[PDB]
Design a protein around this motif. Sequence first.
Motif, PDB file in Angstrom:
ATOM      1  N   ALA A 134      35.843  69.504  55.027  1.00 34.43           N
ATOM      2  CA  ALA A 134      34.579  70.132  55.390  1.00 34.43           C
ATOM      3  C   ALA A 134      33.409  69.159  55.283  1.00 34.43           C
ATOM      4  O   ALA A 134      33.374  68.307  54.393  1.00 34.43           O
ATOM      5  CB  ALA A 134      34.328  71.355  54.524  1.00 34.43           C
ATOM      6  N   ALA A 135      32.455  69.298  56.196  1.00 37.05           N
ATOM      7  CA  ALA A 135      31.247  68.484  56.180  1.00 37.05           C
ATOM      8  C   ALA A 135      30.015  69.378  56.144  1.00 37.05           C
ATOM      9  O   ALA A 135      29.854  70.261  56.986  1.00 37.05           O
ATOM     10  CB  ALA A 135      31.206  67.570  57.392  1.00 37.05           C
ATOM     11  N   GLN A 146      28.303  80.355  65.473  1.00 44.29           N
ATOM     12  CA  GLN A 146      29.034  80.451  64.219  1.00 44.29           C
ATOM     13  C   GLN A 146      30.490  80.859  64.431  1.00 44.29           C
ATOM     14  O   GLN A 146      30.793  81.748  65.227  1.00 44.29           O
ATOM     15  CB  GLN A 146      28.344  81.416  63.250  1.00 44.29           C
ATOM     16  CG  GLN A 146      29.034  81.509  61.899  1.00 44.29           C
ATOM     17  CD  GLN A 146      28.112  81.995  60.798  1.00 44.29           C
ATOM     18  OE1 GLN A 146      27.172  82.749  61.046  1.00 44.29           O
ATOM     19  NE2 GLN A 146      28.379  81.562  59.571  1.00 44.29           N
ATOM     20  N   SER A 147      31.381  80.191  63.709  1.00 45.80           N
ATOM     21  CA  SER A 147      32.802  80.502  63.744  1.00 45.80           C
ATOM     22  C   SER A 147      33.440  80.034  62.446  1.00 45.80           C
ATOM     23  O   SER A 147      32.745  79.769  61.466  1.00 45.80           O
ATOM     24  CB  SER A 147      33.472  79.811  64.929  1.00 45.80           C
ATOM     25  OG  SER A 147      33.441  78.402  64.776  1.00 45.80           O
ATOM     26  N   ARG A 148      34.764  79.930  62.440  1.00 46.13           N
ATOM     27  CA  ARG A 148      35.470  79.442  61.264  1.00 46.13           C
ATOM     28  C   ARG A 148      35.282  77.937  61.125  1.00 46.13           C
ATOM     29  O   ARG A 148      35.256  77.403  60.017  1.00 46.13           O
ATOM     30  CB  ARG A 148      36.956  79.792  61.335  1.00 46.13           C
ATOM     31  CG  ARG A 148      37.789  79.163  60.228  1.00 46.13           C
ATOM     32  CD  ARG A 148      39.205  79.715  60.200  1.00 46.13           C
ATOM     33  NE  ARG A 148      39.232  81.120  59.803  1.00 46.13           N
ATOM     34  CZ  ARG A 148      40.340  81.846  59.689  1.00 46.13           C
ATOM     35  NH1 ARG A 148      41.522  81.303  59.941  1.00 46.13           N
ATOM     36  NH2 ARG A 148      40.265  83.118  59.321  1.00 46.13           N
ATOM     37  N   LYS A 149      35.143  77.256  62.257  1.00 46.14           N
ATOM     38  CA  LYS A 149      34.950  75.812  62.252  1.00 46.14           C
ATOM     39  C   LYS A 149      33.499  75.445  61.952  1.00 46.14           C
ATOM     40  O   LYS A 149      33.231  74.493  61.221  1.00 46.14           O
ATOM     41  CB  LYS A 149      35.386  75.200  63.584  1.00 46.14           C
ATOM     42  CG  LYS A 149      35.298  73.682  63.615  1.00 46.14           C
ATOM     43  CD  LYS A 149      35.723  73.124  64.960  1.00 46.14           C
ATOM     44  CE  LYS A 149      35.692  71.605  64.950  1.00 46.14           C
ATOM     45  NZ  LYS A 149      36.048  71.021  66.274  1.00 46.14           N
ATOM     46  N   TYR A 150      32.564  76.199  62.521  1.00 45.76           N
ATOM     47  CA  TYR A 150      31.148  75.951  62.281  1.00 45.76           C
ATOM     48  C   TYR A 150      30.524  77.072  61.460  1.00 45.76           C
ATOM     49  O   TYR A 150      30.050  78.065  62.013  1.00 45.76           O
ATOM     50  CB  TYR A 150      30.393  75.798  63.603  1.00 45.76           C
ATOM     51  CG  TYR A 150      30.941  74.724  64.516  1.00 45.76           C
ATOM     52  CD1 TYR A 150      30.817  73.380  64.192  1.00 45.76           C
ATOM     53  CD2 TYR A 150      31.569  75.054  65.709  1.00 45.76           C
ATOM     54  CE1 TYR A 150      31.314  72.396  65.026  1.00 45.76           C
ATOM     55  CE2 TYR A 150      32.068  74.078  66.549  1.00 45.76           C
ATOM     56  CZ  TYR A 150      31.939  72.751  66.204  1.00 45.76           C
ATOM     57  OH  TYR A 150      32.434  71.780  67.043  1.00 45.76           O
ATOM     58  N   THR A 209      28.225  73.839  58.197  1.00 41.15           N
ATOM     59  CA  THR A 209      29.471  73.334  57.663  1.00 41.15           C
ATOM     60  C   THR A 209      30.447  73.142  58.794  1.00 41.15           C
ATOM     61  O   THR A 209      30.756  74.076  59.518  1.00 41.15           O
ATOM     62  CB  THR A 209      30.091  74.306  56.653  1.00 41.15           C
ATOM     63  OG1 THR A 209      29.185  74.513  55.569  1.00 41.15           O
ATOM     64  CG2 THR A 209      31.394  73.748  56.112  1.00 41.15           C
ATOM     65  N   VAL A 210      30.943  71.924  58.934  1.00 37.42           N
ATOM     66  CA  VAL A 210      31.895  71.632  59.984  1.00 37.42           C
ATOM     67  C   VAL A 210      33.248  71.362  59.368  1.00 37.42           C
ATOM     68  O   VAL A 210      33.378  70.510  58.501  1.00 37.42           O
ATOM     69  CB  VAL A 210      31.483  70.389  60.790  1.00 37.42           C
ATOM     70  CG1 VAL A 210      32.514  70.080  61.862  1.00 37.42           C
ATOM     71  CG2 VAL A 210      30.110  70.578  61.398  1.00 37.42           C
ATOM     72  N   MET A 211      34.259  72.090  59.817  1.00 41.08           N
ATOM     73  CA  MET A 211      35.589  71.872  59.301  1.00 41.08           C
ATOM     74  C   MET A 211      36.140  70.902  60.309  1.00 41.08           C
ATOM     75  O   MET A 211      36.549  71.282  61.396  1.00 41.08           O
ATOM     76  CB  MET A 211      36.387  73.167  59.294  1.00 41.08           C
ATOM     77  CG  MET A 211      35.690  74.320  58.614  1.00 41.08           C
ATOM     78  SD  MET A 211      35.128  73.955  56.954  1.00 41.08           S
ATOM     79  CE  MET A 211      36.672  73.644  56.125  1.00 41.08           C
ATOM     80  N   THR A 212      36.144  69.634  59.940  1.00 45.23           N
ATOM     81  CA  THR A 212      36.596  68.622  60.810  1.00 45.23           C
ATOM     82  C   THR A 212      38.062  68.651  61.084  1.00 45.23           C
ATOM     83  O   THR A 212      38.829  68.842  60.232  1.00 45.23           O
ATOM     84  CB  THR A 212      36.149  67.275  60.307  1.00 45.23           C
ATOM     85  OG1 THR A 212      36.885  66.912  59.153  1.00 45.23           O
ATOM     86  CG2 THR A 212      34.742  67.328  59.971  1.00 45.23           C
ATOM     87  N   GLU A 258      36.408  63.584  67.381  1.00 43.51           N
ATOM     88  CA  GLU A 258      35.303  63.964  68.212  1.00 43.51           C
ATOM     89  C   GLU A 258      34.201  64.762  67.512  1.00 43.51           C
ATOM     90  O   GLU A 258      33.171  64.982  68.057  1.00 43.51           O
ATOM     91  CB  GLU A 258      35.843  64.692  69.413  1.00 43.51           C
ATOM     92  CG  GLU A 258      36.425  63.801  70.419  1.00 43.51           C
ATOM     93  CD  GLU A 258      37.910  63.748  70.416  1.00 43.51           C
ATOM     94  OE1 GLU A 258      38.520  63.689  71.478  1.00 43.51           O
ATOM     95  OE2 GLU A 258      38.481  63.717  69.357  1.00 43.51           O
ATOM     96  N   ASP A 259      34.487  65.242  66.317  1.00 47.33           N
ATOM     97  CA  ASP A 259      33.582  65.994  65.480  1.00 47.33           C
ATOM     98  C   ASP A 259      32.539  65.112  64.891  1.00 47.33           C
ATOM     99  O   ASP A 259      31.600  65.586  64.375  1.00 47.33           O
ATOM    100  CB  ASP A 259      34.307  66.708  64.344  1.00 47.33           C
ATOM    101  CG  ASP A 259      35.162  67.765  64.799  1.00 47.33           C
ATOM    102  OD1 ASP A 259      36.113  68.052  64.158  1.00 47.33           O
ATOM    103  OD2 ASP A 259      34.905  68.315  65.805  1.00 47.33           O
TER     104      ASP A 259
END
Length: 196
Positions: A23-24, A49-53, A65-68, A72-73
């Motif tokens: 996570a970032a 917003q999602s699970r990744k963002y 929060t970015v789940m890398t 490309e992220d």
Amino acid sequence: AMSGEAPGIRKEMKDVTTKLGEAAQLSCQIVGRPLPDIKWYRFGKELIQSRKYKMSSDGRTHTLTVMTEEQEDEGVYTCIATNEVGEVETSSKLLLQATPQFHPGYPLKEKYYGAVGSTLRLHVMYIGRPVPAMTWFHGQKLLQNSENITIENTEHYTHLVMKNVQRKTHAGKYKVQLSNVFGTVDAILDVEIQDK
């Protein structure tokens, strides 16, 4: 009221580094009255917003929060704060960390075949952050750009092009090497030249 305060940056976004796959958190502080509404942007497009963002705001501190998952992220992320009075913008970059690794999803074969007299291109996809030093070897000879040899190195691949292949000169074992602070990796490609 007659007056509101346009969003003001208290803490601007800062560059953040995280391990690829982890996570970032990209955060910033913007204050306004009325409290600002937050939007996050990526390549001129609004992130939803999602699970990744994951998106967090208490009205003062705004964190994305970015789940890398992929290379490309990495890159630019922009937070835009708005209210009736006005809007402010703040951007920073995400730096990934990953030990050099040949890309799974583009498996390398043991042997590659080039027609005699034709150009042969070896296109190797890799995963590595920060971008690794990339090197090509033919036998014990380190490959360098020349009239018949060209090597394009990118943050996504290392591309070797050989002009006018001949069996005596181009056949044999090749080694592609990728290296960074985290580590090194290499692969051996057996090249064969066929009269055609």
